[PDB]
Design a protein around this nucleic acid. Structure first.
Ligand SMILES: [Mg+2]
Ligand SMILES: [Mg+2]
Ligand SMILES: [Mg+2]
Ligand SMILES: [Mg+2]
Ligand SMILES: [Mg+2]
Ligand SMILES: [Mg+2]
Ligand SMILES: [Zn+2]
Lengths: 175, 132, 36, 58, 207, 142, 134
RNA sequence: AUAAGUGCUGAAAGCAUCUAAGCAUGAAGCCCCCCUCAAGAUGAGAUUUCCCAUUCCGCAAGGAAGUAAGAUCCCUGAAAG
């Protein structure tokens, strides 16, 4: 089938707003979200109904026609409840802690590594061996978790370093 | 120390505007000097910007909305706008020239009556707005 | 593993394109390869 | 001569490769490029020639 | 930043408190005087002018007299311009004394090298010689001019000509002692220029 | 016998805009307004052209992947010293120079062709200082 | 006079800004004087002010004052600074040294006004107007 | 700002995907920062200060003569050659 053809509801507090040049925004119980779209593409919304009218078929139109819909879906979902992603931390003593608003991780390096997030996203730590990022949008938490993981990639010979909240790494043997 | 004139009300014509021209020019030039500029080219450019007919017209219109004036001020503004004289410049129309004449006449009448407390404040406000 | 002739080895190697090049990506990184 | 005629026959909406065709068609106007050119010393007759040309191009 | 202008006088030595020898270059000064200000609304940068070592009134012409008579002082012989500086602690006529360098600071010293004349290659560019025996007829000559194929000489060869006399800047020197009375500045090391010459002592750019 | 005009010519200033136009397609009619091949009195050795002013020169465009793969080379006279610039850095920091180099390759090469090139006035903005010559407007014929 | 304040570094203005403010000063004085004398017709006020505010009458007034042993050292320096300033485009119907000598006069007036030397400027322009009108 | 690489969201292809839209990171390389020369940059720039109320011919353009600020000739020399 196709994903650019499904439908999208709109909760009560979630209020979308159409504007010239197709630059829809959203007002919800967790913050705002604006994202300009392609000028050619047509966006049309009804109460509890989302529609993406596509012009004559082409190679790039069948792509944009799904991209915009997926983005609107992610947007309404984030403004409804928001996304998050945890970060397990195995170590043999590798431990993360909190300091004001920023993050500090004492990996095997010889000096503490500092990680500070941008505005609109917070970094919570529920325990000294786990990190959990929380934010409204999806690409933001994605990028923040990637930049936090890229401090210490997981070694394959033994689980050592940062890894995602649920993932399997391969294992060799060393003697 | 300018000795007073025999009367500052029988100047029915444009003499009020004639003096107000040079008064406003002195004020805006001294202000531009205080800002710091010294080259004559940009000094003259900004001076012309602030002293043009349309600029004075817009400043008068804007100050009209603030009710910054009193009764005799409206009296002298009217007496200035009832002036029919000369020919308007080729670059501008016949309407805004009358507003400029009114502003210049008001400035001249304020100057020629030793009311510097109103004059300095009025020109300070006019310059402040025109430099927006 | 650069070579002018890329083709899957096991059954689970995919073939994609990036920036106008031919790449074979897989789960076992001994099979990852790129044409040109 | 061809450059000057081309310049003088574009302030009328024609070009050269169409003015010349319309002149060869509208009757047989045998005015040489030298004299048709020189007649841009005054641009009242040349406009008449160009109008007679533009007639036959429809 | 900050800086002044003085005269090289010659090298000497001083013992520190550790009891160790230190080469030292002496530089005299006087109260310099700000003669002009170059702001960004009149020019394209920020810079003040400094004067130094006034000269007697017979050796000055009317242009220079009139230029230096707007700060109410005497015709100065050396005029320069210190560009990168804060321009609110300087007024025309005000002075800039030597008392702005504390001990143990780090400065730069700009000066004109001393002339060497028309020098060859072995001395100018520090090249090598040929042999002096074994039947040779080659020593103290600048070498091959290059390959045959270009049919010409590449721009950038190194030949004899006039050496020295350029402008040079030494970096990361250090103040030893600042005699506020006699207007002296003891700088460690040596500085370019012949004795009795103009020397510009600015603050450190690298940091 | 044909009128060969010489020191009997007049000139007139024109204003051209570059907001939303392809390079090489603008500099191909400007480079023939300068030369004089729009005047019924065109003589080939007197430079019967006229002056052209260009504004919004930082709004020019290039089709395809030219803003990354059009290079501008320039050589010094020293060995090894071949310097290079791409089109993005040029259009960002030297727009007027980009347009001057464009137009300069479309004119004759002698000693009249490089005084035809003194009549071109390129600017990067929306206001020009030449408000005394009464410069009229000129929309592109194509 | 007017109620202004001082401008920092008023002894460092080039010869042009001084004349720039002095032209306005002289215009104010001469217009107020022609109005005080008794007149209402703007045509006649222009036709008369264009007798004293021309470079010829200004150069003349300057030569008259100067040849009368009226000035001092600092006014002489300000005169030289006004006359030595080289800029502008000469008017089409005047010499190019009487122009300089009138710019010197306007620079003198402007420098006298920008230092709160009120009474000296007042008497100077008084004698200037008195000569020019005679 | 980039190279190779590592990417985050994301469809064509209901999944997957570094890319086609979009958002990053990433080298002794590249452009600045450091040092020197530089407006004959004939596109010959800017700033500050000195000199200017002459005399002849020439209807006029202009030409000529004495000069002003300043400079040079000539002489005593070297931190220069
Ligand atoms: Mg008026
Ligand atoms: Mg050896
Ligand atoms: Mg050759
Ligand atoms: Mg040819
Ligand atoms: Mg003047
Ligand atoms: Mg000696
Ligand atoms: Zn595989």
């Amino acid at each position: 089938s196709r994903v650019g053809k499904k439908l999208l509801e709109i909760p009560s507090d979630v209020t979308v707003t159409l504007n010239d040049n197709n630059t829809v925004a959203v007002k919800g119980p967790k913050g705002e979200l604006t994202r300009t779209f392609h000028p050619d593409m047509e966006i049309k919304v009804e109460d509890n109904v989302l529609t993406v009218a596509r012009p004559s078929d082409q190679k790039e139109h069948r792509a944009l026609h799904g991209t915009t819909r997926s983005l609107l879906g992610n947007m309404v979902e984030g403004v409804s409840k928001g996304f998050e992603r945890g970060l397990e931390l195995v170590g043999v003593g590798y431990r993360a802690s909190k300091s004001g608003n920023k993050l500090v991780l004492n990996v095997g390096y010889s000096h503490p590594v500092e990680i500070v997030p941008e505005e609109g996203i917070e970094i919570e730590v529920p325990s000294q061996t786990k990190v959990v990022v929380k934010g409204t949008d999806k690409e933001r938490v994605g990028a923040i978790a990637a930049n936090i993981r890229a401090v210490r990639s997981p070694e394959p010979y033994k689980g050592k370093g940062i890894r995602y909240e649920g993932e399997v790494v391969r294992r060799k043997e060393g003697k | 120390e300018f000795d007073t004139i025999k009367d500052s009300k029988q100047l029915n014509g444009l003499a009020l505007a004639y003096i107000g021209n040079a008064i406003f020019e002195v004020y805006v030039r001294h202000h531009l000097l205080k800002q710091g500029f010294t080259k004559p080219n940009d000094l003259h450019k900004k001076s012309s910007r602030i002293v043009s007919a349309k600029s004075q017209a817009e400043i008068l219109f804007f100050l009209q909305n603030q009710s910054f004036f009193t009764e005799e001020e409206e009296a002298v503004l009217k007496r200035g706008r009832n002036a029919k004289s000369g020919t308007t410049p080729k670059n501008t129309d016949v309407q805004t020239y009358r507003y400029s004449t009114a502003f210049e006449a008001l400035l001249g009448y304020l100057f020629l009556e030793k009311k510097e407390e109103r004059l300095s404040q009025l020109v300070a406000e006019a310059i402040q707005f025109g430099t927006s | 593993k650069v070579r002018p002739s890329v083709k899957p080895i096991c059954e689970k190697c995919k073939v994609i394109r990036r920036k106008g090049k031919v790449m074979v990506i897989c789960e076992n990184p001994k099979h990852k390869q790129k044409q040109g | 001569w061809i450059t000057r005629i081309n310049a003088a026959a574009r302030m009328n909406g024609l070009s050269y490769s169409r003015l010349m065709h319309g002149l060869k068609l509208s009757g047989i106007e045998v005015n040489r490029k030298m004299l048709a050119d020189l007649a841009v010393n005054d641009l009242t007759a040349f406009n008449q020639l160009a109008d007679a040309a533009k007639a036959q191009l429809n | 930043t900050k800086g002044i202008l003085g005269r090289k006088i010659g090298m000497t030595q001083v013992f520190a408190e550790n009891g160790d020898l230190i080469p030292v270059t002496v530089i005299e000064a006087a109260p310099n005087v700000v003669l002009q200000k170059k702001t960004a609304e009149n020019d394209g940068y920020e810079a003040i002018q400094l004067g130094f070592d006034d000269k007697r009134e017979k050796l000055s012409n009317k242009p220079e007299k009139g230029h230096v008579a707007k700060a109410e002082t005497a015709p100065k012989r050396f005029v320069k311009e210190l560009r990168g500086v804060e321009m609110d602690a300087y007024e025309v006529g005000q002075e800039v004394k030597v008392e702005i360098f504390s001990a143990g600071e780090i400065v730069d010293v700009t000066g004109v090298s001393k002339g060497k004349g028309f020098q060859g290659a072995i001395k100018r560019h520090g090249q090598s010689r040929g042999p002096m025996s074994h039947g040779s007829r080659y020593h103290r000559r600048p070498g091959s001019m290059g390959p045959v194929d270009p049919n010409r000489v590449f721009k950038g060869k190194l030949l004899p000509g006039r050496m020295g006399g350029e402008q040079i800047t030494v970096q990361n020197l250090e103040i030893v002692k600042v005699d506020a009375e006699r207007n002296l500045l003891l700088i460690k090391g040596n500085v370019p220029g012949a004795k009795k010459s103009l020397i510009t002592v600015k603050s450190a750019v690298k940091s | 016998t044909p009128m060969a005009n010489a020191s009997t010519i007049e000139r007139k200033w024109l204003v051209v805009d570059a907001a939303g136009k392809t390079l090489g397609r603008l500099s191909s009619e400007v480079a023939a307004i300068l030369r004089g091949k729009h005047k019924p009195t065109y003589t080939p050795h007197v430079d019967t052209g006229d002056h052209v002013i260009i504004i919004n020169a930082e709004k020019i465009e290039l089709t395809g992947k030219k803003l990354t793969d059009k290079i501008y080379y320039r050589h010094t006279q020293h060995p090894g010293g071949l310097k290079s610039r791409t089109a993005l850095e040029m259009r960002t920091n030297y727009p007027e120079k980009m347009l001057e180099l464009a137009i300069k390759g479309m004119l004759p090469k002698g000693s009249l062709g490089r005084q035809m090139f003194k009549k071109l006035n390129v600017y990067r903005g929306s206001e020009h200082p030449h408000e005394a010559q009464k410069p009229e407007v000129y929309e592109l014929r194509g």
